[PDB]
Design an enzyme around this catalytic site. Structure first.
Site, PDB file in Angstrom:
ATOM      1  N   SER A  25      70.645  51.465 116.731  1.00 32.21           N
ATOM      2  CA  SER A  25      71.003  52.812 116.235  1.00 32.21           C
ATOM      3  C   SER A  25      70.197  52.975 114.927  1.00 32.21           C
ATOM      4  CB  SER A  25      72.469  52.974 116.001  1.00 32.21           C
ATOM      5  OG  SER A  25      72.909  52.086 115.008  1.00 32.21           O
ATOM      6  N   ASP A  75      71.701  46.966 115.827  1.00 32.32           N
ATOM      7  CA  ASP A  75      72.183  47.325 117.193  1.00 32.32           C
ATOM      8  C   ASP A  75      71.261  48.368 117.844  1.00 32.32           C
ATOM      9  OD1 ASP A  75      72.778  49.795 116.154  1.00 32.32           O
ATOM     10  OD2 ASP A  75      74.911  49.799 116.671  1.00 32.32           O
ATOM     11  N   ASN A 101      75.014  57.674 111.231  1.00 29.78           N
ATOM     12  CA  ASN A 101      74.566  56.709 112.256  1.00 29.78           C
ATOM     13  C   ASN A 101      74.565  57.345 113.649  1.00 29.78           C
ATOM     14  OD1 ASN A 101      74.594  54.439 114.019  1.00 29.78           O
ATOM     15  ND2 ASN A 101      75.348  53.145 112.366  1.00 29.78           N
ATOM     16  N   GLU A 113      73.138  55.030  99.497  1.00 33.06           N
ATOM     17  CA  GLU A 113      72.781  55.119 100.944  1.00 33.06           C
ATOM     18  C   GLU A 113      71.300  55.513 101.059  1.00 33.06           C
ATOM     19  OE1 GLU A 113      74.207  54.145 103.501  1.00 33.06           O
ATOM     20  OE2 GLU A 113      76.390  53.979 103.077  1.00 33.06           O
ATOM     21  N   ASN A 146      69.237  50.231 112.399  1.00 34.77           N
ATOM     22  CA  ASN A 146      70.339  49.228 112.372  1.00 34.77           C
ATOM     23  C   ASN A 146      70.013  48.100 113.360  1.00 34.77           C
ATOM     24  OD1 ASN A 146      72.429  52.112 112.172  1.00 34.77           O
ATOM     25  ND2 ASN A 146      71.988  50.746 110.450  1.00 34.77           N
ATOM     26  N   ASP A 191      70.277  55.205 111.003  1.00 33.96           N
ATOM     27  CA  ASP A 191      71.000  56.023 110.004  1.00 33.96           C
ATOM     28  C   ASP A 191      70.061  57.115 109.466  1.00 33.96           C
ATOM     29  OD1 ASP A 191      73.200  54.299 110.347  1.00 33.96           O
ATOM     30  OD2 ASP A 191      73.045  53.450 108.276  1.00 33.96           O
TER      31      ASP A 191
END
Ligand SMILES: [N]
Ligand SMILES: [N]
Ligand SMILES: [Pt+2]
Ligand SMILES: [Pt+2]
Ligand SMILES: [Pt+2]
Length: 129
Positions: free
Chosen positions: A50, A48, A59, A35, A46, A52
């Site tokens: 958002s 959309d 998120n 990650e 991301n 992380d």
């Protein structure tokens, strides 16, 4: 902070992640490697809108408030910046809520695609925990 492998395994064990909801410490260390590359400061936007955050790439869509994710939730009730600390307490506490929500570690795309069903014990090999 960029953790070493055994340094992070030890920190995750201290904060109660070893066997947390049946996920061995190797699963959590594997998830963190793919990650964040063990980097507390890691951020990734991301598709959309958002973002992380942190060692486990939590998120903003669901778990934290970053002030720029419209119509999202803050189910860990934390600013996403808390997830970037050299101290992993906020990331661990929020990850326990996530992994408990019914989908287990499938929440972490990198865990599902790179860790699930592999020899995760290899991630804690040699570590004084
Ligand atoms: N820790
Ligand atoms: N924690
Ligand atoms: Pt260190
Ligand atoms: Pt700690
Ligand atoms: Pt803790």
């Amino acid at each position: 902070k960029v953790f070493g492998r055994c340094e992070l395994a030890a920190a995750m064990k201290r904060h109660g992640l070893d066997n947390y909801r049946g996920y061995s410490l190797g699963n959590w260390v594997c998830a963190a490697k793919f990650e964040s590359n063990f980097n507390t400061q890691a951020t990734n936007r991301n598709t959309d809108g958002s973002t992380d955050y942190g060692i486990l790439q939590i998120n903003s869509r669901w778990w934290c408030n970053d002030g720029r994710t419209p119509g999202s939730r803050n189910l860990c009730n934390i600013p996403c910046s808390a997830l970037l600390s050299s101290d992993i307490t906020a990331s661990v506490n929020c990850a326990k809520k996530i992994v408990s929500d019914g989908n287990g570690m499938n929440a972490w795309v990198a865990w599902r695609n790179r860790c699930k069903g592999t020899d995760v014990q290899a991630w804690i090999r040699g570590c004084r925990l």
